[model samples]
Target: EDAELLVTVRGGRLRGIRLKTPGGPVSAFLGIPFAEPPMGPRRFLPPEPKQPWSGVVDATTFQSVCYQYVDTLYPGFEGTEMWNPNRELSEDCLYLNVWTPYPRPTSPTPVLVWIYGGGFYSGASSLDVYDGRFLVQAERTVLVSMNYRVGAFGFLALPGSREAPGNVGLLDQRLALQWVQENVAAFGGDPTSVTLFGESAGAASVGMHLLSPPSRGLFHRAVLQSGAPNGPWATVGMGEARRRATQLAHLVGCPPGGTGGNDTELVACLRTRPAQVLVNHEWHVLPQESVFRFSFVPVVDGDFLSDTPEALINAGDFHGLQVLVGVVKDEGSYFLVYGAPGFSKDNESLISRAEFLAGVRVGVPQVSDLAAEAVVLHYTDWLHPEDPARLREALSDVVGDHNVVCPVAQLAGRLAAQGARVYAYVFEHRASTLSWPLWMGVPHGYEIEFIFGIPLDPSRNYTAEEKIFAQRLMRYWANFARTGDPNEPRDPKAPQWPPYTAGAQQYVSLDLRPLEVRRGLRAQACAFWNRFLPKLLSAT
Candidate 1:
């Protein structure tokens, strides 16, 4: 086998590496620029096409990660640091990476474009866990991952000539997808057979792309893991956009106000400050509620994003494309036991009755106190009421449902309603190596370990059961990427996965064995949220 590898993209000639994989040798083109650097004069504007280079570019090492603050894992948690970028950082970060079994293709191969999720505040393409070679070799497809601007640099908006037009991060993603369409063919990927895939913020991004007009025709299929565009924390409107923009400007000592109508001074003032100065600033809470609040994300500006996603989907405005949607069984367990105060407190006796109710209000700030109480009562299990640990477990269930599970199920329904081919899933495999306590069933990002083939390291080895299940899961995922269908079982015993329908909402329950097709995922909890939250909140 040839050890040397080189490929020519539209931009220029490139030298990549051939890494030997268990399945086969895969070509890796890492850190190739997809857009012009978002720096100096180009700080927060929409992405611009990169100019072609004159000679072969070295595309072996991962580039500097996009400038943002990576969350420092709380000291006690060891394995939770799965996402830290063990690399340099820079503002000129608009690069992407690609992986394929062969550098040149005999036939056009399927492509999977990954968008990493970091709450709109942090994440990068070069993280250790997001490596695409394994999936590329095993699935016999092309994989692409790109870095986009994040934090205020990516989403800040002012109302003037230099409005910065919020959602430049999303626009960065759009430009990168266009890059794939224009250049992936050079690396054996079919331009027409692209699939958009992501998790958490990345998942929500794929969902938003499904709704955005500018992102149309970039990809034909999507796999949304744990989020949708309409999910809580996916978007903020222009009002919230300006408020946060203004707050950020004040923190950096930029000339207050948006230069009246011009915005030249405000934009210039921000561009002059160091990138570190921007990310190092303090984060202020807006609603005073910890749950569902995000520091930065895409906001509606009548351009890239037109309206609330709920409004768009309700008006019959979205893709008729093939989609796979899913949520972990205990998506909200981490936040319940860790981040939020009052609720995550250890002492059950110190837990204020009002504070428990306040946790519900955080997600549904609109619902009346009485209605919030009712929603809580519907899910709270008094069956295990006496034990404080049991109460904590109950709180975990409600938070997960409100923030992730219900919202994701709600999206599958809308996608089904749009006459699109939709598949749904519930990931329930627990990882002993995860920083999260193992008893909390499949916390947020657990499925990611399985999806990426990450294994346990020292004390506890990777589960014998998980290794088998992950292989099957990837077969399903890769099948979806290759043919827009995940039910292509290689064996007869493998359950036939069903598509989600309007009347019959079927979802597969994925675990260590017998991945069963289950019905009515949190039906009671979501039904109550869908029916009552609005009337309760809007009531005078």
Candidate 2:
């Protein structure tokens, strides 16, 4: 069979491409620059339209992954076989890849734009798990994924930075969406019928976009896997982030107001520095904790984000779009392994009340007496007096509550109040084929396998039942992407999914046995934290 070729004009670049699917028609395309590369004078600035290319450019291979800390941070991510061998790390990485069942011009298939997540530091559109062939072939949706800036290049905030301000990564996403809006039709996708989906930090980025003023009207619906708007782990103000960056510069010998002063100058100096120097440096990890402590977040800079995302959503700022949001059962366990051991060991007998108070003050300044008390009481079974499982459950609940559950529920409530459609789920299947036994019971990011349609790691030896569960999940997800409702009947084997409502608080619980329309258990705890905790903490 002859290979299919397709062409399109993007940012003055004449892109050339070809696509192949076994037992399916081949489709392809070329030069599609979503935005100009962040280089020289354009560094750190919002994306500018690409200049036209006189000659055809090859769009065969995937582009470099954005500059990120992932290679060093999560050295041995599972499912290594799917890793992108062509992954490069560079600043000139504003590119995207598409896979279609048939790249005909008139198909108008639904579009799925994927954003990779790595604590705002690392990821690419070409990750193995994110391969869209299955989605395009099975669900008949155009799968589009793109590279965005990461780490110092993407999110670093410095005083007087010009080319781009904080949230350049997010701005890059917006530009890519704009490109999709204008050009996806040429690739067999309906630009107007777009659904944004992501996991972890990518999910968090989606949450930020939900509140971003510039992002309004770009996509019709959103899916947040395990991240939300108001988590302490979300983006903080740019000024505060810049302050930390200043401290990092000083630590690396660039003192504040020194010769390498201002955001641009410091960025230039850091860019030329060894990648390992930045990678191995403690400063890289310092900011991760800041999210949990000071609420390191994408700043609500009046231009991009008018207010905090939670505040904006509650104020009915979102464009009345449909939303599907949820988290895994043991979402916080991943943080215990990847970031810190906040939930690992018991703090009851190990630390005194006074010491606990001091730790709370020193560890997380956002902790109010009421909030701290609420957390301690909620997580520790003082009333029960002595129950190990209760303590562990409490610890898990505290981490899950403040970080994932509360924020997600609050956002859902606010969105529902605004008359938007919301669908929520809890991925509770404990026996994941990809999960490490040490991590214990469907840790954070476990949903990636199901969503991406990747097979389980053979070493985990998943039973036949587990495989069936994964398939059901992908069907639910793909169905949602197709029509903004995951409940569409994809398989006779799978159960029906009910729409989420405030009064019933209905949510699908994906467990060993899948079921629908269950009331969420986290509502009471999330309600207390969202309504009273923030105010009480701010007063303190």
Candidate 3:
């Protein structure tokens, strides 16, 4: 393969060029604009197609990330120690990065479009954690990652906010997929066989795409990791999203009943404001327990979303596509460190303390009642009761159920009932290398290392078993990407995995031995959560 710097016009932008591998004779393109910058008059609106440029545009470097507040609370972020770096912060930040194995006109490679997650508030396609080199090289797939608006810019949903309604971040993803459909063949990717995958918030976004009307036919298959369709609006109405955006507008000095000031005006004012000011003002003013705290999520707007994804799946309206969804052993532990410190320690005690602090009885209506208590009790009492470490495991199941487990199970059941193939798994291997302060078993995103087949960080220790486990995971994931099935035989030494079916309900149990196919491990908690389906559907 002759290594040549290649540049192809996409969505009417002349982006810069590069190479996919180091010193390998393969062509590549760096940052390419798929949509015009979502700033100025175009703010909060559906992404506009990028205009064609007459000259060669230098896309040698990744573009600046969308406006975001860097929290010192979490470690491992770029440019946190410095004050005001030279990076540009503007609405003109809808560029995407592309890596092609050969960038030739003849080879039609499989396309993998990645959506990054930062709770819908932060995340860029340029993050170090998402390096797609290994997957692209091994699978011979074309990899694409793009930056979308986040936080206020991406998800603010007040009345008259935008003509396109809310979930602009999702719309951005949809538009990127459309761009790929129209132009990816130029980069040698099969547009019809694209797979959308993401972790955490990104995975949740994928779930939304599966449900959104505008996103239909955008992708053929999907992969969701450590995230599911279970946000407030994931089952409720966008009334809460609208109310929160209205509150945000009032805080930003916008008039309460000003219909003349549309999404563009609000975005104009927001764009010029400091990032810290937006974060603080929004953080302080919103009610502590208000669902608005988790803004920038896909709202259940009746038109775009119609109903919660769970309801939609039950109604048999979802794209009957092959799907893979799962959760880590300890998914909630990360949020406990990030947002809910004491709650992760003891759920029952924490619920009691929270009720007392709110000055209401334990079962009071709305004021001090723990809404999540019933679901918590169900998981703790029935599933995995034998595990001596029930508190942490229970909390993990609760979070996992709400975030990843339940929604996926519900969706998978509905899809399977409708005659679609679904594969599920549980990542139970504890990372010896990346152990945190607390033994928050497999702490949330610890599975990323295994998924990427990357070596454990030097700061952490990895047993030989853990290394073998990572290799197994990589094989499973890669097989899934290649054939929509992850049951490839684990290297020469491992056992032959089976495909998931309703009878067997066969889900790969990832651990030391790594093959446990039971029918009812997570059934109880899933059933308990489904009990709230009527309430969730009626909330709108």
TM-score of each predicted structure versus truth: 0.92, 0.85, 0.82
- For model 2, where is the 10-residue window of minimal lDDT? 341-350
Clashing pairs in 1: none
Report the CA-based lDDT of candidate 1 relative to the real structure. 0.77
Reference-based lDDT, each prediction: 0.77, 0.66, 0.63
* Candidate 3 wrongly placed segments (more than 4 Å): 1-3, 11-28, 74-89, 102-106, 159-164, 233-236, 256-276, 289-293, 317-320, 341-390, 456-471, 489-494, 512-515, 532-540
RMSD of each: 2.8, 4.3, 5.1
Give the alpha carbon lDDT tens digit for every residue of 127-151 in model 3. Answer: 6556565555445677788888877
2 or 3, greater by lDDT: 2
TM-score for candidate 1: 0.92
Backbone clashes in model 3, listed as residue pairs? 16-59, 433-461
Comparing 1 and 2 on lDDT, the stronger one: 1
Q: What digit string (tens of lDDT, one per residue) describes model 2 on residues 186-264?
A: 6778888889998877888887877775786788889988877666666677677777666655656663453747666
User: Which candidate model has the greater TM-score, 1 or 2?
Assistant: 1
Tell me how candidate 3 scores on lDDT. Answer: 0.63
